[PDB]
């Protein structure tokens, strides 16, 4: 639903094997609250998992096992921005791919263990 | 309060290098990223480096293996290594970070490229 902090992804598409993709999310509204943002992915029939994170004033990093080094995480903390670079794409990485802020240590899943989510990208990767 | 002060910069040959240093102060350095910012004439002011308190460096795609940006914790000083100047980056460059609520910006020195 709503929500104090607006998030939008947007960059997504249909690539092929190898292909690179870079993702984008505009965080709006009190972005001065952010403390720390992710991306997360929605394999299908799955459940939404995580992928990178990023602390907002730290900017340190991390990857979910899967990335194996090809994904890179990054934000903006003054254009209010958090960004995935996406190398080597294989079909496995085909998903929707959610943008989150600010995780939340009570919730009973993933969803609910981050105040504030985007409306998710799809990502298509063949060959 | 926290102050980031900038130095160096100025004129400079396109193909030249420059080095502009940030010295911070009241803020607790080591635990902060800091970032170069710019403002090129009738362009909205822009990301060009930014360094976390890990060490991982992201660049701009306009200066990637032309600038380097460094840190010395001991220091509170962080570095940008201008190299292969050209007139794109003729801009006001800012230095960076956000302790809290507030952003934290240097006074801006200039970065003036001609031939």
């Known amino acids: 639903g709503p929500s104090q902090v607006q998030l939008q992804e947007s960059g997504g598409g249909l690539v092929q094997a190898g292909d690179s993709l870079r993702l984008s999310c505009a965080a709006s509204g009190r972005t001065w609250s952010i403390y720390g943002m992710g991306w997360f992915r929605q394999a299908p029939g799955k459940e939404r998992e995580f992928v990178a994170g990023?602390?907002?004033?730290?900017?340190?990093?991390h990857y979910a096992d899967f990335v194996k080094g090809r994904f890179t995480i990054s934000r903006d903390n003054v254009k209010n921005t958090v960004y995935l670079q996406m190398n080597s794409l294989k079909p496995e990485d085909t998903a929707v791919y959610y943008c989150?802020?600010?995780?939340?240590?009570?919730?009973?899943?993933?969803?609910?263990?981050?105040?504030?989510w985007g409306q998710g990208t799809q990502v298509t990767v063949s060959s | 309060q926290g102050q980031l002060v900038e130095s160096g910069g100025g004129l400079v040959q396109a193909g030249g290098s420059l080095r502009l240093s940030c010295a911070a102060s009241g803020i607790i350095f080591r635990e902060l990223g800091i970032d170069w910012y710019r403002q090129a004439p009738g362009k909205q002011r822009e990301l060009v480096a930014s360094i976390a308190s890990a060490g991982m460096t992201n660049y701009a795609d306009s200066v990637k293996g032309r600038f380097t940006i460094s840190r010395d914790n001991a220091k509170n000083t962080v570095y940008l290594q201008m190299n292969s100047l050209k007139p794109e980056d003729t801009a006001v460059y800012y230095c960076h970070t956000l302790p809290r609520f507030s952003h934290l910006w240097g006074q801006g020195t200039r970065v003036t490229v001609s031939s």
């Open positions: 989150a802020a600010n995780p939340n240590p009570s919730g009973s899943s993933v969803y609910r263990r981050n105040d504030y």
């Open positions: 990023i602390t907002w004033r730290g900017g340190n990093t």
